[PDB]
């Protein structure tokens with residue numbers, strides 16, 4: 001591929017001449033990524049000479065259960081291969097989609113990034129692995145199937161995709177801006193977001209479990225239900241207005257540790273920034 | 275097994291004397307299927323001499339990212355092993371369940387086919403991988419568990435299964451016709467269908483995301499919610515009556531490309547067939 | 549690890565000096581478990597000399613499709629490695645969580661046991677694999693993210709976790725008793741239980757599909773919906789009172805086979821124990 005995966009971005013910044021020790025049975029995709037480096041099956045590992053790469057999450061659990069792993073820092077010294085959505089201490093990219101710091105999501109949102117459904121994902125955003133993000137099929141035609149186009153010749157493909165781009169309900173997310181997910185967002189298990197109608201999820205939004213959101217979620221609102229309805233705002237109006245332009249999620253690691261009291265007490269946060 | 279898998283049906287029609295090149299680390303099930311053929315780890319692949327079989331979907335993505343793959347047509351020259359529900363250009367079978375053309379579904383619906391819960395799946399049907407199809411346990415007894423029968427002797431098993439067949443609410447889908455899923459059907463993510471009470475899903479039906487359907491879905495109806503309620507019909511009544519017996523989903527690949535305008539414009543479809 | 553996995557508990561009781569035959573490609577975790585025993589790739593298997601261990605569930609299906617498997621009893625002679633939640637004929641443990649007999653659950657509930665969210669799981673309980681059990685993040689602060697704490701030093705971690713323990717809404721299930729799931733419970737697909745607010749699920753409870761439960765479920769109640777509401781009780785009040793202290797789920801395998809008629813007919817059950 002032309003766009004670097006999460007494993008390749010981590011290695012580019014933290015490997016630093018060491019050889020990669022593979023903790024687990026590798027995939028063909030992994031062997032292609034490790035081709036330029038020296039790599040081997042992990043036996044005796046030393047973080048001064050080695051960088052452990054666990055193939056799967058279950059292989060990571062086995063590695064952390066090993067006594068050899070407690071001299072290995074999270075991303076500086078190891079990583080999970082099959083974890084494109086895993087959180088990171090630095091801003092990264094996922095199929096031309098910027099992902100903030102300490103932001104994690106599941107395989108469904110990863111596939112949504114590759115489909116072009118997402119424009120950006122904020123910092124300190126927590127998304128459950130079971131969450132799904134898909135677009136709508138076309139509804140202005142006699143059929144709803146998408147793989148019917150596998151039978152169209154050119155002449156038929158040109159006219160089918162012609163109406164697709166000229167559709168105000170955005171089938172396959174064709175005619176809309178890619179959806180943005182803000183910072184400090186929480187998304188629960190079994191949640192769903194429609195990539196055809198949702199174009200923005202505000203910062204600090206909370207999506208309940210089993211919730212099916214079909215429209216935009218304003219910042220710091222808690223949407224819940226099937227379909228998702230706003231049941232309560234997370235903060236007061238004055239806080240949401242202030243929080244939107246102070247942007248604590250863009251602070252440095254030292255500045256977050258300086259204003260712990262402001263981030264911990266919401267009543268103190270307004271006092272310092274209202 | 276006695277019933278051919280999707281990989282075996284594809285190979286039986288398109289392999290044509292070539293040897294299989296395995297793109298990825300194979301499973302024991304795959305090695306059993308490839309036993310009669312000549313097979314090897316894929317290196318340099320040529321579609322005139324080789325047929326690429328990617329073990330998993332992630333191995334398929336790695337194969338398509340390789341320059342060698344662009345002389346390989348979808349099913350005629352490659353396929354994914356762990357993809358029993360993947361779409362195909364020809365009608366196939368899945369555990370004694372006929373599956374139409376360009377119809378795809380996930381692992382939960384595959385397991386539903388093997389359980390005998392499904393009778394047939396139409397053509398050009400799109401089912402999300404997260405969709406689940408299960409039956410109800412028995413409710414006319416003091417227990418709801420199913421694996422309690424692991425402790426029954428013969429005498430106890432005969433009487434337990436005796437009432438199971440004599441139950442009008444169809445526990446474990448015992449006393450009903452297997453459920454039929456029509457053509458041009460769309461099923462969203464996190465959807466659920468009760469195999470104990472649902473016996474038919476009409477052609478052209480649309481099941482929303484997170485929807486739990488518990489009764490039959492009439493053709494070209496859009497069921498939505500927990501539980502699923504009909505919120506709107508996809509087409510006018512006159513169209514549904516006409517569409518049910520013209521059956522465009524049974525047209526040839528040449529006839530679909532002949533009547534693209536009818537399938538693309540619903541207003542034109544009635545003009546040509548009303 | 550210090551706590552035995554489900555595979556290690558089964559082997560400790562049923563292996564009995566035999567060598568393990570691995571049906572499938574093993575993981576690194578599996579190789580660590582089989583280290584003290586003699587093990588090999590399964591070829592010709594005899595239950596008098598061998599104990600088959602299928603790595604994955606798909607490898608189990610391949611094994612049962614083999615003619616060699618029909619002299620192998622379920623747990624006494626084989627088992628699936630990647631199946632920590634699979635049912636068993638004897639009471640077992642899962643990350644310091646007692647699991648009853650013939651009780652099965654999915655990977656999400658397994659991870660919930662390791663997180664400390666569950667105290668015990670009853671006997672003859674049926675939980676769907678797609679079910680999820682998670683706790684709530686903190687809501688009394690300006691942020692909702694959990695992995696923000698990866699940036700806190702000591703001083704910041706001590707004060708963040710300080711309010712976490714002093715929170716009546718139980719973020720991360722910090723200040724509550726671990727949730728108990730009773731016996732003869734049925735949980736459907738796509739179900740969700742909030743580990744932060746739910747502390748008990750009574751015996752004989754039934755959770756419908758796609759249901760999001762947020763409070764305790766009384767014994768023998770059927771909760772349904774988003775959010776889950778009690779729609780109907782499974783039995784009469786007099787039965788629930790009697791069933792709660794006869795505890796048929798604690799009977800021996802011989803006593804279950806003695807009182808099949810009582811367990812099969814609910815009307816007969818009260819006659820014998822009311």
Ligand SMILES: CC(C)(COP(=O)(O)OP(=O)(O)OC[C@H]1O[C@@H](n2cnc3c(N)ncnc32)[C@H](O)[C@@H]1OP(=O)(O)O)[C@@H](O)C(=O)NCCC(=O)NCCS
Pocket residue numbers: 126127128187188189206207208209210222224225231682683684687717742760762774775
């Ligand atoms: C969304 C959530 C944070 C709400 O937390 P909360 O502040 O304690 O909400 P409350 O318990 O006070 O109840 C608020 C109302 O909204 C409803 N509600 C809240 N969360 C709901 C949910 N997931 N689903 C359905 N209804 C919900 C409640 O039924 C309640 O109804 P009411 O208006 O009649 O009182 C929490 O319930 C939740 O579901 N978090 C997601 C859990 C998860 O999936 N984690 C995995 C991802 S890490």
Ligand SMILES: CC(C)(COP(=O)(O)OP(=O)(O)OC[C@H]1O[C@@H](n2cnc3c(N)ncnc32)[C@H](O)[C@@H]1OP(=O)(O)O)[C@@H](O)C(=O)NCCC(=O)NCCS
Pocket residue numbers: 134135136139169194212214226227400401402461462463480481482483484496498499505
């Ligand atoms: C079902 C679906 C096609 C409806 O499309 P639509 O024609 O644009 O429906 P609308 O947006 O006009 O809204 C219709 C009504 O039904 C509701 N509704 C529609 N889809 C819903 C859904 N999945 N869940 C809950 N409610 C839904 C809407 O809330 C709305 O309510 P209203 O009567 O008060 O106005 C679409 O919403 C959907 O969910 N598709 C499934 C997406 C998916 O899961 N893809 C993965 C599988 S490939």
Ligand SMILES: CC(C)(COP(=O)(O)OP(=O)(O)OC[C@H]1O[C@@H](n2cnc3c(N)ncnc32)[C@H](O)[C@@H]1OP(=O)(O)O)[C@@H](O)C(=O)NCCC(=O)NCCS
Pocket residue numbers: 408409410413443468486488500501674675676735736737754755756757758770772773779
């Ligand atoms: C929960 C369940 C056992 C109810 O069975 P039941 O006794 O036949 O319930 P009924 O069909 O008589 O309907 C009862 C009412 O509750 C509703 N209801 C029942 N189950 C529901 C469900 N999963 N979701 C939403 N609504 C449900 C029905 O819509 C109905 O509504 P009403 O009050 O207007 O009549 C069953 O519907 C179910 O969903 N089982 C879980 C299936 C599953 O997920 N299996 C996989 C795990 S092994």
Ligand SMILES: NC[C@@H]1O[C@H](O[C@H]2[C@@H](O)[C@H](O[C@@H]3[C@@H](O)[C@H](N)C[C@H](N)[C@H]3O[C@H]3O[C@H](CO)[C@@H](O)[C@H](O)[C@H]3N)O[C@@H]2CO)[C@H](N)[C@@H](O)[C@@H]1O
Pocket residue numbers: 107108110111112114115134135136137146147172331332335360361378400402403404
């Ligand atoms: N290109 C996105 C892909 O998404 C995959 O995950 C999901 C889907 O994108 C994937 O797509 C299915 C596919 O199974 C099947 N073989 C073909 C079918 N047309 C697709 O259907 C789906 O994907 C396409 C996007 O390409 C959408 O246009 C369509 O609306 C949607 N139903 O099925 C998976 C479960 O629904 C993988 N995560 C990933 O390998 C890949 O990035």
Ligand SMILES: NC[C@@H]1O[C@H](O[C@H]2[C@@H](O)[C@H](O[C@@H]3[C@@H](O)[C@H](N)C[C@H](N)[C@H]3O[C@H]3O[C@H](CO)[C@@H](O)[C@H](O)[C@H]3N)O[C@@H]2CO)[C@H](N)[C@@H](O)[C@@H]1O
Pocket residue numbers: 381382384385386388389408409410411420421446605606609634635652674676677678
């Ligand atoms: N035979 C169907 C199987 O379905 C599997 O997928 C799902 C279930 O069928 C499977 O079945 C579970 C099983 O985990 C566990 N080891 C035993 C338990 N009795 C089963 O329970 C389930 O399956 C049976 C059907 O056999 C139903 O009667 C029962 O109502 C249902 N709860 O758990 C999986 C998640 O719920 C596999 N896709 C597939 O290997 C296999 O075909």
Ligand SMILES: NC[C@@H]1O[C@H](O[C@H]2[C@@H](O)[C@H](O[C@@H]3[C@@H](O)[C@H](N)C[C@H](N)[C@H]3O[C@H]3O[C@H](CO)[C@@H](O)[C@H](O)[C@H]3N)O[C@@H]2CO)[C@H](N)[C@@H](O)[C@@H]1O
Pocket residue numbers: 057058061086087104126128129130655656658659660662663682683684685694695720
């Ligand atoms: N320690 C529990 C783990 O749960 C895992 O499954 C699920 C989660 O526990 C897991 O945790 C995610 C994780 O993906 C990501 N790398 C880090 C993130 N902080 C976690 O987030 C989640 O887990 C933690 C519990 O540790 C909760 O406090 C948090 O509320 C929750 N959002 O993401 C998975 C899907 O949501 C695995 N089943 C298992 O390896 C492991 O036991």
